[PDB]
Amino acid sequence: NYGYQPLFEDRRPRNIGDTLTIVLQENVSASKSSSANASRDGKTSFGFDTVPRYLQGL
Amino acid sequence: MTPLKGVDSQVYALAQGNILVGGVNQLNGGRITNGAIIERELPTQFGAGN
């Protein structure tokens, strides 16, 4: 003799020892990224090609 | 021949016979007189105690 069993309810596991099907469908995906940058240029110049006489002292 | 189960899914009676439909009236439902025979008995505690 087994216990009371419902009629219209689905067959769910209810006690220790009942079986149940697992459908393994796992799909995980993670990601990350980053960056950084910096820059600097400089260029100076000056040239007195032909100096007049009254400025030759400087 | 049809077995009649309880709520514990055990056979308590066996049913077989001719159906009597009224013949508005219901056509998809009938009743059979003395159509089942008891096969299992239930225990009881009648007669025990005061």
Curated annotation (Swiss-Prot), chain A:
It comes from the Bacteria. It is found in: Cell outer membrane; Bacterial flagellum basal body. Assembles around the rod to form the L-ring and probably protects the motor/basal body from shearing forces during rotation. The basal body constitutes a major portion of the flagellar organelle and consists of four rings (L,P,S, and M) mounted on a central rod. Belongs to the FlgH family. This is Flagellar L-ring protein. The gene is flgH. The chain holds residues 59 to 116 of 232 of the full protein.
Curated annotation (Swiss-Prot), chain B:
Assembles around the rod to form the L-ring and probably protects the motor/basal body from shearing forces during rotation. The basal body constitutes a major portion of the flagellar organelle and consists of four rings (L,P,S, and M) mounted on a central rod. It is found in: Periplasm; Bacterial flagellum basal body. Belongs to the FlgI family. The gene is flgI. It comes from Salmonella typhimurium (strain LT2 / SGSC1412 / ATCC 700720). Coiled coil: none annotated. This is Flagellar P-ring protein. The chain holds residues 123 to 183 of 365 of the full protein.
